[PDB]
Design an enzyme around this catalytic site. Structure first.
Site, PDB file in Angstrom:
ATOM      1  N   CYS A  24       0.845  -1.181   0.000  1.00 52.54           N
ATOM      2  CA  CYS A  24       0.000   0.000   0.000  1.00 52.54           C
ATOM      3  C   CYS A  24       0.891   1.245   0.000  1.00 52.54           C
ATOM      4  O   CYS A  24       0.481   2.309  -0.464  1.00 52.54           O
ATOM      5  CB  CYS A  24      -0.947   0.003   1.196  1.00 52.54           C
ATOM      6  SG  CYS A  24      -2.280   1.219   1.027  1.00 52.54           S
ATOM      7  N   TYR A  99      20.987  -4.216  -1.112  1.00 53.72           N
ATOM      8  CA  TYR A  99      20.162  -5.329  -1.549  1.00 53.72           C
ATOM      9  C   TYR A  99      20.408  -6.543  -0.653  1.00 53.72           C
ATOM     10  O   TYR A  99      21.557  -6.881  -0.378  1.00 53.72           O
ATOM     11  CB  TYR A  99      20.473  -5.657  -3.011  1.00 53.72           C
ATOM     12  CG  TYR A  99      19.856  -6.933  -3.528  1.00 53.72           C
ATOM     13  CD1 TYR A  99      18.484  -7.045  -3.668  1.00 53.72           C
ATOM     14  CD2 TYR A  99      20.642  -8.014  -3.907  1.00 53.72           C
ATOM     15  CE1 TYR A  99      17.900  -8.203  -4.156  1.00 53.72           C
ATOM     16  CE2 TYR A  99      20.076  -9.175  -4.407  1.00 53.72           C
ATOM     17  CZ  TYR A  99      18.699  -9.268  -4.527  1.00 53.72           C
ATOM     18  OH  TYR A  99      18.104 -10.404  -4.994  1.00 53.72           O
ATOM     19  N   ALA A 100      19.326  -7.198  -0.214  1.00 52.85           N
ATOM     20  CA  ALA A 100      19.442  -8.431   0.548  1.00 52.85           C
ATOM     21  C   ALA A 100      18.900  -9.567  -0.309  1.00 52.85           C
ATOM     22  O   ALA A 100      17.733  -9.536  -0.702  1.00 52.85           O
ATOM     23  CB  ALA A 100      18.691  -8.325   1.853  1.00 52.85           C
ATOM     24  N   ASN A 104      12.657 -11.320   2.940  1.00 47.79           N
ATOM     25  CA  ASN A 104      12.287 -10.987   4.304  1.00 47.79           C
ATOM     26  C   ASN A 104      12.322 -12.251   5.150  1.00 47.79           C
ATOM     27  O   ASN A 104      12.226 -13.348   4.604  1.00 47.79           O
ATOM     28  CB  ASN A 104      10.973 -10.213   4.390  1.00 47.79           C
ATOM     29  CG  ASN A 104       9.731 -11.066   4.263  1.00 47.79           C
ATOM     30  OD1 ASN A 104       9.667 -12.192   4.757  1.00 47.79           O
ATOM     31  ND2 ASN A 104       8.709 -10.511   3.642  1.00 47.79           N
ATOM     32  N   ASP A 148       7.729  -0.624  14.130  1.00 43.15           N
ATOM     33  CA  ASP A 148       7.101  -1.539  13.186  1.00 43.15           C
ATOM     34  C   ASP A 148       7.931  -2.815  13.036  1.00 43.15           C
ATOM     35  O   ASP A 148       8.110  -3.344  11.933  1.00 43.15           O
ATOM     36  CB  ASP A 148       6.784  -0.824  11.869  1.00 43.15           C
ATOM     37  CG  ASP A 148       5.881  -1.569  10.892  1.00 43.15           C
ATOM     38  OD1 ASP A 148       5.173  -2.522  11.305  1.00 43.15           O
ATOM     39  OD2 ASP A 148       5.886  -1.170   9.708  1.00 43.15           O
ATOM     40  N   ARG A 152       8.414  -9.725   8.743  1.00 42.96           N
ATOM     41  CA  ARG A 152       8.253  -9.247   7.377  1.00 42.96           C
ATOM     42  C   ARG A 152       9.053  -7.969   7.141  1.00 42.96           C
ATOM     43  O   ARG A 152       9.243  -7.569   6.001  1.00 42.96           O
ATOM     44  CB  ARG A 152       6.781  -8.943   7.087  1.00 42.96           C
ATOM     45  CG  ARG A 152       5.996 -10.119   6.520  1.00 42.96           C
ATOM     46  CD  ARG A 152       4.500  -9.832   6.592  1.00 42.96           C
ATOM     47  NE  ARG A 152       3.868  -9.730   5.285  1.00 42.96           N
ATOM     48  CZ  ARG A 152       2.786  -9.002   5.005  1.00 42.96           C
ATOM     49  NH1 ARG A 152       2.196  -8.257   5.926  1.00 42.96           N
ATOM     50  NH2 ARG A 152       2.301  -9.013   3.776  1.00 42.96           N
ATOM     51  N   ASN A 153       9.496  -7.316   8.219  1.00 43.69           N
ATOM     52  CA  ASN A 153      10.248  -6.081   8.084  1.00 43.69           C
ATOM     53  C   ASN A 153      11.734  -6.300   8.392  1.00 43.69           C
ATOM     54  O   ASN A 153      12.464  -5.323   8.603  1.00 43.69           O
ATOM     55  CB  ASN A 153       9.645  -4.954   8.929  1.00 43.69           C
ATOM     56  CG  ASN A 153       8.229  -4.600   8.534  1.00 43.69           C
ATOM     57  OD1 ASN A 153       7.442  -4.207   9.387  1.00 43.69           O
ATOM     58  ND2 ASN A 153       7.882  -4.769   7.269  1.00 43.69           N
ATOM     59  N   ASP A 166      12.623  -1.357   6.795  1.00 39.00           N
ATOM     60  CA  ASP A 166      11.345  -0.668   6.783  1.00 39.00           C
ATOM     61  C   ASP A 166      11.251   0.345   7.916  1.00 39.00           C
ATOM     62  O   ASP A 166      10.489   0.159   8.854  1.00 39.00           O
ATOM     63  CB  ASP A 166      10.136  -1.608   6.718  1.00 39.00           C
ATOM     64  CG  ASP A 166       8.906  -0.897   6.162  1.00 39.00           C
ATOM     65  OD1 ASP A 166       8.891   0.378   6.140  1.00 39.00           O
ATOM     66  OD2 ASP A 166       7.977  -1.603   5.735  1.00 39.00           O
TER      67      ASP A 166
HETATM   68  C1  LIG Z   1      11.537  -5.616   4.644  1.00 38.25           C
HETATM   69  C2  LIG Z   1      12.044  -4.538   3.749  1.00 38.25           C
HETATM   70  N1  LIG Z   1      10.963  -3.555   3.589  1.00 38.25           N
HETATM   71  S1  LIG Z   1      11.110  -2.637   2.176  1.00 38.25           S
HETATM   72  O1  LIG Z   1      12.452  -2.097   2.062  1.00 38.25           O
HETATM   73  O2  LIG Z   1       9.932  -1.797   2.152  1.00 38.25           O
HETATM   74  C3  LIG Z   1      10.790  -3.868   0.918  1.00 38.25           C
HETATM   75  C4  LIG Z   1       9.468  -4.222   0.727  1.00 38.25           C
HETATM   76  C5  LIG Z   1       9.166  -5.185  -0.216  1.00 38.25           C
HETATM   77  C6  LIG Z   1      10.179  -5.797  -0.928  1.00 38.25           C
HETATM   78  C7  LIG Z   1      11.496  -5.456  -0.707  1.00 38.25           C
HETATM   79  C8  LIG Z   1      11.816  -4.488   0.226  1.00 38.25           C
HETATM   80  N2  LIG Z   1      13.130  -4.106   0.496  1.00 38.25           N
HETATM   81  C9  LIG Z   1      14.315  -4.715   0.107  1.00 38.25           C
HETATM   82  N3  LIG Z   1      15.436  -4.031   0.325  1.00 38.25           N
HETATM   83  C10 LIG Z   1      16.534  -4.703  -0.008  1.00 38.25           C
HETATM   84  N4  LIG Z   1      16.610  -5.951  -0.465  1.00 38.25           N
HETATM   85  C11 LIG Z   1      15.457  -6.576  -0.611  1.00 38.25           C
HETATM   86  N5  LIG Z   1      15.557  -7.859  -1.129  1.00 38.25           N
HETATM   87  C12 LIG Z   1      14.508  -8.749  -1.409  1.00 38.25           C
HETATM   88  C13 LIG Z   1      13.176  -8.546  -1.102  1.00 38.25           C
HETATM   89  C14 LIG Z   1      12.194  -9.462  -1.441  1.00 38.25           C
HETATM   90  C15 LIG Z   1      12.524 -10.632  -2.079  1.00 38.25           C
HETATM   91  N6  LIG Z   1      11.537 -11.590  -2.411  1.00 38.25           N
HETATM   92  C16 LIG Z   1      10.121 -11.377  -2.165  1.00 38.25           C
HETATM   93  C17 LIG Z   1       9.345 -12.242  -3.145  1.00 38.25           C
HETATM   94  N7  LIG Z   1       9.555 -13.671  -2.764  1.00 38.25           N
HETATM   95  C18 LIG Z   1       8.798 -14.641  -3.579  1.00 38.25           C
HETATM   96  C19 LIG Z   1      10.995 -14.016  -2.500  1.00 38.25           C
HETATM   97  C20 LIG Z   1      11.861 -12.874  -3.008  1.00 38.25           C
HETATM   98  C21 LIG Z   1      13.859 -10.836  -2.371  1.00 38.25           C
HETATM   99  O3  LIG Z   1      14.218 -11.990  -3.042  1.00 38.25           O
HETATM  100  C22 LIG Z   1      15.431 -11.699  -3.725  1.00 38.25           C
HETATM  101  C23 LIG Z   1      15.740 -12.896  -4.604  1.00 38.25           C
HETATM  102  N8  LIG Z   1      14.972 -12.714  -5.865  1.00 38.25           N
HETATM  103  C24 LIG Z   1      14.653 -13.995  -6.541  1.00 38.25           C
HETATM  104  C25 LIG Z   1      13.831 -13.747  -7.799  1.00 38.25           C
HETATM  105  O4  LIG Z   1      14.337 -12.677  -8.615  1.00 38.25           O
HETATM  106  C26 LIG Z   1      14.679 -11.460  -7.939  1.00 38.25           C
HETATM  107  C27 LIG Z   1      15.614 -11.731  -6.781  1.00 38.25           C
HETATM  108  C28 LIG Z   1      14.838  -9.919  -2.049  1.00 38.25           C
HETATM  109  N9  LIG Z   1      14.294  -5.981  -0.348  1.00 38.25           N
END
Ligand SMILES: CCNS(=O)(=O)c1ccccc1Nc1ncnc(Nc2ccc(N3CCN(C)CC3)c(OCCN3CCOCC3)c2)n1
Length: 288
Positions: A24, A99-100, A104, A148, A152-153, A166
């Site tokens: 959202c 990037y992680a 989550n 928060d 998930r965060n 987050d």
């Molecule tokens: C909590 C943070 N809150 S946020 O910053 O608002 C925020 C809110 C939502 C999403 C990301 C963020 N943030 C953020 N910042 C830095 N890094 C990351 N990495 C990351 C995140 C999600 C996945 N997902 C979710 C979907 N699932 C099905 C598993 C994969 C993920 O998988 C990476 C591996 N994939 C494999 C496929 O191809 C692309 C690469 C790596 N996310």
């Protein structure tokens, strides 16, 4: 947005890629950033980029701005996602974070439940918890309340470092309006200290309550808090003294630690410092 010199990143040096998630709040995509790592201005780094969606509201924008501002004010720590930069000029606000690769913590734990895809050991669960307590102890020391905390965060890096993320609802300790009826209106109820709603305050000790729910999520390998209980019934149940039950295969001691986090009186909950010391002990004596 007044131009921030240290933090601004060239729009032309960033290449947006596969989407990571959509809420959202907005959307996050993978991307390549050439030179974001000064002093390696040659090298392109995988990053994550947070930005608005097409249906964004005024509040959406100012929330993304605050999240960015907050990330600038807290120093580097091993267990907090780092802000890498921002494109803020002549185009949509882009907030660039590290990037992680493993997503989550909720998804991470679920994907590696026992088959009945590298199964979690008890030690691994304790290590996750310990890492997160260290991150929160740091945050508290920087006068930051996250508000928060939830699985998930949390983000998980390639080498299984836990990263508190987050910062969309996070505040300086002095930037909450005590006792106003709208304060804490946007905190997820199942993760929230009772005093946040009953009293309309927020302290580090309120984060401790949230930490307890996070621990429960960890030890249930990504289960859903208060299963079968609707949010509109929760506070009545908490006043009456209801607390979630012990996760299978969690020890009595770790459960007492959860329960301590869920003390009705904020000052009777452990501090993050105390959680760190306790978890440090449990982790080490597990190893031996
Ligand atoms: C909590 C943070 N809150 S946020 O910053 O608002 C925020 C809110 C939502 C999403 C990301 C963020 N943030 C953020 N910042 C830095 N890094 C990351 N990495 C990351 C995140 C999600 C996945 N997902 C979710 C979907 N699932 C099905 C598993 C994969 C993920 O998988 C990476 C591996 N994939 C494999 C496929 O191809 C692309 C690469 C790596 N996310």
């Amino acid at each position: 947005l007044p131009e921030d010199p240290k933090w601004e990143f060239p729009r032309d040096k960033l290449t947006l890629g596969k989407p990571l998630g959509e809420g959202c709040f907005g959307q996050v995509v993978m991307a390549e950033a050439v030179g974001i790592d000064k002093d390696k201005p040659k090298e392109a780094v995988t990053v994550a980029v947070k930005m608005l969606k097409d249906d964004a509201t005024e509040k959406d924008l100012s929330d993304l701005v605050s999240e960015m501002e907050m990330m600038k004010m807290i120093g580097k720590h091993k267990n907090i996602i780092n802000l890498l930069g921002a494109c803020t000029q002549d185009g949509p606000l882009y907030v660039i974070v590290e990037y992680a690769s493993k997503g989550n913590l909720r998804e991470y734990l679920r994907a590696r439940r026992p088959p009945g895809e590298e199964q979690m050991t008890f030690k691994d669960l304790v290590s996750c918890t310990y890492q997160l307590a260290r991150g929160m102890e740091y945050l508290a020391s920087q006068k930051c309340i996250h508000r928060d905390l939830a699985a998930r965060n949390v983000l998980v890096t390639e080498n299984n470092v836990m990263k508190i993320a987050d910062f969309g609802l996070a505040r300086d300790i002095n930037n909450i309006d005590y006792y106003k009826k709208t304060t804490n209106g946007r905190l997820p109820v199942k993760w929230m200290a009772p005093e946040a709603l009953f009293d309309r305050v927020y302290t580090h000790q309120s984060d401790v309550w949230s930490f307890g729910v996070l621990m429960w999520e960890i030890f249930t390998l990504g289960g859903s808090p208060y299963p079968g209980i609707p949010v509109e019934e929760l506070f009545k149940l908490l006043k009456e003294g209801h607390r979630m039950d012990k996760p299978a295969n969690c020890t009595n001691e770790l459960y007492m630690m959860m329960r301590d986090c869920w003390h009705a009186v904020p000052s009777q909950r452990p501090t993050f410092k105390q959680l760190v010391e306790d978890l440090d002990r449990i982790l080490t004596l597990t190893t031996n």
